[PDB]
Ligand binder design. Structure first.
Ligand SMILES: [Cu+2]
Ligand SMILES: [Cu+2]
Ligand SMILES: [Cu+2]
Lengths: 318, 318, 318
């Protein structure tokens, strides 16, 4: 099916945690960028208007671009970069299927690492595997690493001597992430995307992690474990059978990724909450938490195929 | 079977190498903590008494905690932290089988990374696989990374700007590690545990590394190679057929992990010594080494199931 | 067959990119060291003459050294280091087959990390697998990370505090690497060698990466993806079917590995060029590039088995 989407690139303020804000060059003014959810084989057109003062592109990471290399989105290799004020059109077939993503390919050490120029590109297989068909809830987790010294210095950063100090899932750090809420008998798919500069070791308590897909491609047999080491650019789809009611941590097991600046108990961390046990526990950090749906695109993935903006991810224009 | 153990948490001084000491919050005053060696399906009870001045927990990494989530050991999620002077009891079934471990889950960027709050939990399968039955000697290697600027500053550390400078197997750096002593025909199992903040690349000379288990679970077929990339929280069991008499290095292949402070020839490094070739070689660093048995818990793993303390790992009370 | 090679170790100046030179201890005055290309089972002799003022060895990484441990090349373990002015002879069988390499084993934090003391050791199998027989072009990419502050301070470096700032394929950074030139129907084998201190995440646009070998050993089935996480010491052979004409980036997806000093658009990066689409494009960085053959040993690997020096990699004597 033919599908046509429009994206703008806007100077945008976001807040990672507390008072830690950041200047971003955000697609449709949100970080992560809009979800693009299409069927394997769809013919996609994207029109990208640059409303910032710096050049950009969009590269579609995981798209083979068969016969369409001039839409690969690499400045000085497949196109002239999109200059401020200009519009560029990308045209490609959505293939192969799987957890893909898209990001700017200009000055990546700054733009992708710390300017939020990334979003998920989910391509549905025409014929999903049996394991895919057991999934009841589908989550996207984009992992990023930020250097706060460059928070309000657009056009700069991503250089030797940088001190990484904030770590996010979908551009929020714990305790401002959202819980993953389930019931016994659910099967969840965690689509982990290595959007950052660091390796992350994603560990889930109380459950068997079934690493079932790498870079969109199904593994011969899922690998069982409890910690998934994921590097920059990689994607892993982890399937978890929700057979064990409780309150359960999901976090980066690299301990320096669980801090917010110099404070512990932050960074890349959330929880799985089963409705069977409830959250009314005197010790529980999130007993009084106001839940925000769609923080992992888990509701938007249930909508009709297309591009989905998010009020959850929208920042403030600069 | 029902098994009941006691642990204290004590302020403890350990020495990594030479004159490099560290302040630790040690389980039973030792680092690594006591070996817990039990059968799959055993009902384990652990009474934990906090004799330090900071709060702690024990998380049982790899234990599914089926129906026992309140024993998962996460402060502000599954319990209130164990306050100084108090005793908390963990109750869980030992499952699944494999190389597991335990560690504090309070302020992990400090407590786990640099206060030695970790030990091995070995759960024997009721029906071991054929490859496991070939094993003649079993070794536990826990890999850690230390920041010496915080050595004597308990309650501080694990923050942006930290400079890692010491690297250990079971809390010692080379040359104060111990040789792995074998004879031709032996089959050894190295249980590698990523207790640290960094990825380690464990390389063994003269032999084929058979990567046979990840996070306790058997891989469909062992992966053959010579270098095992292991990240924080992961465990890998590597089986080696001892068919090649000589003196053989095993070391982290990340070169910055083989230094003691700014001196070369240290960190995560030991040798494999075959009795056939002997150690009487003029060039050999360890020709006159005082051998310490049980440095990899290789002697304790042969004893009756239960908890094993060791004077080898015991520090000095602070 | 019996094969005998000579290597000198010489103080040598190389240039990574632009004006960024480095003092190296180079085998035959080149970095990477000469290609050794032999058949599985060949009996190799290497006479190594030290013409520098520091001690060195050569370790043959991936060589089992069955019965030949005293040729393993580890100082203080299998030999006395080779002193200045001295000659040491290594004798071993070339086994097993695969992408192996060789490097000094003295003060590796300096000598291997930043003194260029490494080269490829390709051992051809007697009976290649069906996937190996589909390969039309064979490339060697040795990945390194450098600390420029020690560039001209031989005998120093590789210590806590170091700031890594240059990243290379075969001792050159983009834009001074060379394009990989193919035609439709080609099948290329990228032999990736983790010669550096860092993990690298090698990402190829427009093609499916088939990760087919680890540490020289064939994987049960190739793993499909687009990004290969490769750690220090590891080797991965990636097979790519060239079925998609275009100009395509290959680069390290850790974004801080794509900078030269504090400048973007450098580091571990090159392109694949299909002859069908040409290079005459106004936006293309390398439209006017002077192509230098054998930058990936792609020509030398086609020559008769033996040792191959390279003018491309030759530095200047110091
Ligand atoms: Cu951009
Ligand atoms: Cu603690
Ligand atoms: Cu050397």
């Amino acid at each position: 099916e033919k599908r046509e989407f429009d994206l703008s690139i806007e100077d945008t303020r976001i807040v990672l945690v507390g008072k830690r804000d950041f200047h971003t060059f955000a697609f449709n003014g949100q970080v992560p960028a809009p979800l693009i959810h299409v069927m394997e084989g769809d013919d996609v057109t994207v029109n990208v208007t640059n409303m910032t003062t710096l050049p950009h592109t969009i590269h579609w990471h995981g798209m083979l671009q068969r016969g369409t290399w001039q839409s690969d989105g690499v400045p000085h290799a497949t196109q002239h970069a999109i200059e401020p004020g200009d519009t560029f059109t990308y045209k490609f077939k959505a293939e192969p299927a799987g957890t893909m993503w898209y990001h700017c390919h200009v000055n990546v050490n700054e733009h992708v690492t710390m300017r939020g120029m990334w979003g998920p590109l989910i391509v549905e297989p025409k014929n999903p595997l049996p394991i895919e068909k057991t999934v009841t809830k589908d989550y996207i987790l984009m992992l990023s690493d930020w250097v706060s010294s460059w928070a309000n210095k657009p056009g700069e950063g991503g250089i030797p001597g940088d001190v990484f100090d904030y770590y996010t899932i979908n551009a929020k750090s714990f305790p401002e992430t959202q819980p993953i809420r389930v019931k016994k008998g659910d099967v969840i798919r965690l689509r982990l995307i290595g959007a950052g500069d660091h390796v992350h070791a994603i560990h889930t308590h109380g459950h068997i992690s079934q690493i079932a897909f790498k870079d969109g491609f199904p593994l011969d047999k899922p690998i069982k474990g409890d910690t998934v080491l994921i590097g920059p650019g990689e994607r892993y789809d982890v399937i978890l059978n929700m057979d064990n009611p409780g309150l359960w941590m999901i976090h980066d097991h690299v301990d320096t990724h669980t801090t917010n600046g110099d404070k512990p108990d932050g960074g890349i961390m959330t929880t799985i909450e089963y409705e069977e046990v409830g959250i009314d526990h005197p010790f529980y950090v999130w007993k009084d938490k106001k839940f925000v749906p769609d923080f992992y695109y888990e509701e938007s993935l249930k909508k009709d195929l297309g591009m989905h903006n998010s009020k959850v991810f929208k920042g403030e224009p600069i």
